[PDB]
Amino acid sequence: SPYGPEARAELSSRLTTLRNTLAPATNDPRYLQACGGEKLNRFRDIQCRRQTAVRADLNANYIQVGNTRTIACQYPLQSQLESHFRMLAENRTPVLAVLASSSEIANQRFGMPDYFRQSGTYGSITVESKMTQQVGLGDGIMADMYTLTIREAGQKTISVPVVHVGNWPDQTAVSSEVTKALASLVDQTAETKRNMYESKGSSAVADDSKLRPVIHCRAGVGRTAQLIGAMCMNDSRNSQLSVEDMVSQMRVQRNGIMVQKDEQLDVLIKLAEGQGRPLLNS
Ligand SMILES: O=Cc1cccc([C@@H]2CC(=O)CS2(=O)=O)c1
Secondary structure (H helix, E strand, O other), rough: OOOOOHHHHHHHHHHHHHHHHOOOOOOOOOOOOOOOOOOOOOOOOOOOEEEEEOOOOOOOOEEEEEOEEEEEEEEHHHHHHHHHHHHHHOOOOOOHHHHHHHHHHHHHHHOOOOOOOOEEOOOOEEEEEEEEEHHHHHHHHEHHHEEEEEEEOOOOOOEEEEEEOOOOOOOOOOHHHHHHHHHHHHHHHHHHHHHHHHHHHOHHHHHOOOOOEEEOOOOOHHHHHHHHHHHHHHHHHHHHHHHHHHHHHHHHHHOOOOOOOOHHHHHHHHHHHOOOOOOOOO
């Protein structure tokens, strides 16, 4: 079976070698380095590929899996919020998908600022948050939606749709069914926003650094990677892109932890199987 235990063990073997090889060394030229004493990486060993980095002071990466273009990042640190909002505005972000739980955000020990559910001022940027609809995704998993209106004197005002899944626990995989529902919601949300820009003649539509969905959880490697893999499978341009390719690309473009847990890989495998998509490269 191309999805049996032998295939899965070979997949794991290739991916584990890759993870181990991509582990960050001290002052690794492959990874973005903190430029002074301000902390860059939320987690010391979850680093940001330098060549695909979005901003010099964020742990955030441009990701292209097959043809699917996204930004994956860590939950921004308090000191990073103004730069994070500039990244969101500059990218004309068509959807921000936050997969960190409400309980994580509320726990002040974790230093996860509540930046999208409340209005705020961050240096010269002001942000207005408004709640919109709520969508059940299956298995009691809920998506709460918001818009963030990002204002700054002398910048164009940009509003960003947010899909917050507030009850996807750390270090778990929601089911393949929930994942597919979530991927559809995120893609549909992005498409509606992109369409609006297109309807106004917007130039962002010609630029590939822009109009990227931005996805983060806590570290931006587990729940984030599971969603991005699912989104890549929802994109018809990615026929024959293997699970091996998809995971390897996320790893070389962000870090070797992408798809952190076996159960998160298993959801990708199950989604691939449902499509007749290969696990391994021949
Ligand atoms: O040390 C790495 C680390 C620390 C806290 C959380 C995680 C998460 C694993 C997940 O399932 C989603 S995540 O936030 O990338 C990874």
